[PDB]
Design a protein around this motif. Structure first.
Motif, mmCIF file in Angstrom:
data_model
loop_
_atom_site.group_PDB
_atom_site.id
_atom_site.type_symbol
_atom_site.label_atom_id
_atom_site.label_comp_id
_atom_site.label_asym_id
_atom_site.label_seq_id
_atom_site.Cartn_x
_atom_site.Cartn_y
_atom_site.Cartn_z
ATOM 1 N N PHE A 56 0.827 -1.201 0.000
ATOM 2 C CA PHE A 56 0.000 0.000 0.000
ATOM 3 C C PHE A 56 0.866 1.257 0.000
ATOM 4 C CE2 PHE A 56 0.411 -1.699 4.318
ATOM 5 C CZ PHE A 56 1.107 -0.672 4.922
ATOM 6 N N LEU A 57 2.080 1.132 0.524
ATOM 7 C CA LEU A 57 3.007 2.256 0.586
ATOM 8 C C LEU A 57 3.460 2.666 -0.812
ATOM 9 C CD1 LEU A 57 4.832 1.031 3.715
ATOM 10 C CD2 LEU A 57 4.529 3.488 3.354
ATOM 11 N N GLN A 58 3.423 1.717 -1.742
ATOM 12 C CA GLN A 58 3.829 1.981 -3.117
ATOM 13 C C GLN A 58 3.038 3.145 -3.705
ATOM 14 O OE1 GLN A 58 6.371 0.048 -5.150
ATOM 15 N NE2 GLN A 58 6.869 0.021 -2.960
ATOM 16 N N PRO A 59 3.631 3.823 -4.700
ATOM 17 C CA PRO A 59 3.000 4.966 -5.366
ATOM 18 C C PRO A 59 1.810 4.550 -6.226
ATOM 19 C CG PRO A 59 5.026 4.372 -6.491
ATOM 20 C CD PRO A 59 4.963 3.523 -5.251
ATOM 21 N N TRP A 60 2.009 3.527 -7.049
ATOM 22 C CA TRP A 60 0.952 3.033 -7.923
ATOM 23 C C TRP A 60 -0.263 2.592 -7.114
ATOM 24 C CZ3 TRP A 60 -0.573 -1.935 -6.994
ATOM 25 C CH2 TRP A 60 0.319 -2.749 -6.284
ATOM 26 N N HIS A 61 -0.010 1.990 -5.955
ATOM 27 C CA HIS A 61 -1.084 1.521 -5.087
ATOM 28 C C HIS A 61 -2.062 2.650 -4.774
ATOM 29 C CE1 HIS A 61 -2.556 -1.886 -2.825
ATOM 30 N NE2 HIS A 61 -1.404 -2.513 -2.981
ATOM 31 N N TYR A 63 -4.227 2.523 -2.012
ATOM 32 C CA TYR A 63 -4.266 2.656 -0.560
ATOM 33 C C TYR A 63 -3.285 3.724 -0.086
ATOM 34 C CZ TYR A 63 -6.973 -1.668 -0.467
ATOM 35 O OH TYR A 63 -7.946 -2.624 -0.649
ATOM 36 N N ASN A 64 -2.241 3.952 -0.875
ATOM 37 C CA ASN A 64 -1.230 4.947 -0.537
ATOM 38 C C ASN A 64 -1.875 6.294 -0.224
ATOM 39 O OD1 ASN A 64 0.980 7.161 -1.845
ATOM 40 N ND2 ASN A 64 1.807 5.586 -0.474
ATOM 41 N N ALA A 65 -2.945 6.612 -0.945
ATOM 42 C CA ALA A 65 -3.655 7.869 -0.744
ATOM 43 C C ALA A 65 -4.132 8.004 0.698
ATOM 44 C CB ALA A 65 -4.833 7.970 -1.702
ATOM 45 N N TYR A 66 -4.677 6.922 1.240
ATOM 46 C CA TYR A 66 -5.175 6.922 2.611
ATOM 47 C C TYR A 66 -4.031 7.083 3.607
ATOM 48 C CZ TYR A 66 -7.379 5.339 6.933
ATOM 49 O OH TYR A 66 -7.840 5.248 8.226
ATOM 50 N N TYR A 67 -2.944 6.357 3.373
ATOM 51 C CA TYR A 67 -1.780 6.418 4.249
ATOM 52 C C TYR A 67 -1.316 7.858 4.438
ATOM 53 C CZ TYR A 67 3.018 5.893 5.900
ATOM 54 O OH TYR A 67 4.192 5.996 6.612
ATOM 55 N N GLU A 68 -1.292 8.614 3.344
ATOM 56 C CA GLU A 68 -0.868 10.008 3.388
ATOM 57 C C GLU A 68 -1.720 10.805 4.372
ATOM 58 O OE1 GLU A 68 0.376 12.575 0.174
ATOM 59 O OE2 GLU A 68 2.191 11.830 1.163
ATOM 60 N N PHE A 69 -2.989 10.428 4.487
ATOM 61 C CA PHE A 69 -3.910 11.108 5.390
ATOM 62 C C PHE A 69 -3.559 10.814 6.846
ATOM 63 C CE2 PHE A 69 -8.233 11.399 7.445
ATOM 64 C CZ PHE A 69 -8.259 12.780 7.437
#
Length: 90
Positions: A56-61, A63-69
């Motif tokens: 999820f940490l990956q850029p393409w992923h 879920y990454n969007a949520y992690y940033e939050f």
């Protein structure tokens, strides 16, 4: 070994945040609070692993969007400077 192969991602279609499942929700938050305390430097380590658990940490992923939050949450929760930006109207 060598360490350092293909360290750049392309521009992929990503926007808005998506509500992940309850199985990954607690898996992304746990890291957020961790990187918020330890430091962004940690994010560079977990990324180097590129493990299935840390995808999820990956850029393409997406879920990454949520992690940033979450990262910002725990961050501002225990700090978060303002840094005023110089004005420059038209």
């Amino acid at each position: 070994g060598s360490s350092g192969s293909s360290g750049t991602s392309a521009l992929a279609p990503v926007a808005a945040i998506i509500p992940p499942p309850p199985d990954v929700q607690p898996v992304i938050d746990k890291l957020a609070e961790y990187v918020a305390r330890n430091g962004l430097k940690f994010e560079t380590s977990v990324r180097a692993k590129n493990d299935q658990r840390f995808e999820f940490l990956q850029p393409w992923h997406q879920y990454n969007a949520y992690y940033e939050f979450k990262k910002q949450f725990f961050l501002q929760k225990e700090g978060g400077d303002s840094m005023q930006a110089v004005s420059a109207p038209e």
